[PDB]
Write a structure and sequence with these properties.
The complex is a heterodimer of chains A (about 120) and B (about 130). In chain A, a hairpin with a 4-residue loop joins strand 7 and strand 8 (about 75-80). Chain A has about 120 residues and is mainly beta. Chain A has no helices and 11 strands. Chain A has a single domain (about 1-125), classed as Immunoglobulin-like (Sandwich), CATH 2.60.40.10. In chain A, strands 2, 4, 5, 6, 9, 10 and 11 form a 7-stranded mixed β-sheet that branches. Chain B has a single domain, classed as Lysozyme. Chain B is globular. In chain B, strands 1-2-3 form a 3-stranded antiparallel β-sheet. In chain B, strand 1 (about 45) and strand 2 form a beta hairpin. Chain B has about 130 residues and is mainly alpha-helical. In chain B, helix 1 packs across helix 2. Classes of the chains: A mainly beta (about 120), B mainly alpha (about 130). The interface between A and B is medium-sized, with 22 and 16 residues. Chain B: It is found in: Secreted. Chain B: It is an enzyme of class 3 (hydrolase). Chain B: Monomer. Chain B: Keywords: Allergen, Antimicrobial, Bacteriolytic enzyme, Disulfide bond, Glycosidase, Hydrolase, Secreted, Signal.
Chain lengths: ~120, ~130
């Protein structure tokens, strides 16, 4: 399994950014995809995940502002981040992991394929 | 509260989990490590609409009531908030009910994918128990 991520960068508070993540290597679409972020001096936090059914789950801190989508047949996911805040600054990592009867969650330990990640910096 | 590894091993042993349902103490400590990273306040949302709570990430669809999960059964008969205390009593008591069924610890998905079948005794080595 391999992951290719793109997007990210600097933007002023209140603005938006879109991240994308393409996966290859799975034999089917029965897996989880999500984004986890590491803010300076903090531990990785799962912020948005999506299953093969297109269902989603979000960290309370980003609900409503971040929208994760997935083209299941294309093994690709997107994170549309609107109304960004300084507190959103962090290294963002796309990750793929084991699904459990079609359900996916925000626990990073249940994701076993990670990538280089992308830096997102939101200036006040 | 974020428990230290041996601190939690001691607490779980005191709470009677060593060999409960045939699962050695290391299984329980490993479960907590991968389910919640030893954090009693850990909460994770799932795409099926449920939420997992606490040191052992007990699920709101079957085990506790959080008032926001359709199809709630609340088999442990407790509010999910009870599973977020620094005191692990409620989480242990509910985990004992869960694991007593035939599926055993397979109920814990992180444990299943990170601990099951591995050298779990390593998780209690170096600990004064």
């Amino acid at each position: 399994v391999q992951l290719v991520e793109s997007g990210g960068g600097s933007v002023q508070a209140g603005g938006s950014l879109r991240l994308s993540c393409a996966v290859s290597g799975y034999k089917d679409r029965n897996y989880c995809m999500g984004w986890f972020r590491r803010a300076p001096g903090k531990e990785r936090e799962g912020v948005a995940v999506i299953d093969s059914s297109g269902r989603t789950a979000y960290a309370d801190s980003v609900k409503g502002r971040f929208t994760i989508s997935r083209d299941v047949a294309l093994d690709t996911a997107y994170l549309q981040m609107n109304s960004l805040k300084p507190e959103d600054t962090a290294m963002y990592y796309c990750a793929a992991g084991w699904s459990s009867l079609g359900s996916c969650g925000t626990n990073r330990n249940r994701y076993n394929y990670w990538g280089q990640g992308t830096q997102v910096t939101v200036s006040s | 509260k974020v428990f230290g590894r041996c601190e939690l091993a001691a607490a779980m042993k005191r709470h009677g989990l060593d060999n409960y349902r045939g699962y050695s103490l290391g299984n329980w400590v490993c479960a907590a490590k991968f389910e919640s990273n030893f954090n009693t306040q850990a909460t994770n949302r799932n795409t099926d609409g449920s939420t997992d709570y606490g040191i052992l990430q007990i699920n709101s669809r079957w085990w506790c009531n959080d008032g926001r999960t359709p199809g709630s059964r609340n088999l442990c008969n407790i509010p999910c908030s009870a599973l977020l205390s620094s005191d692990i009593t409620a989480s242990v008591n509910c985990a004992k009910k869960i694991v007593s069924d035939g599926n055993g610890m397979n109920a814990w998905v992180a444990w299943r994918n990170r601990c099951k079948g591995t050298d779990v005794q390593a998780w209690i080595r170096g600990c004064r128990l």
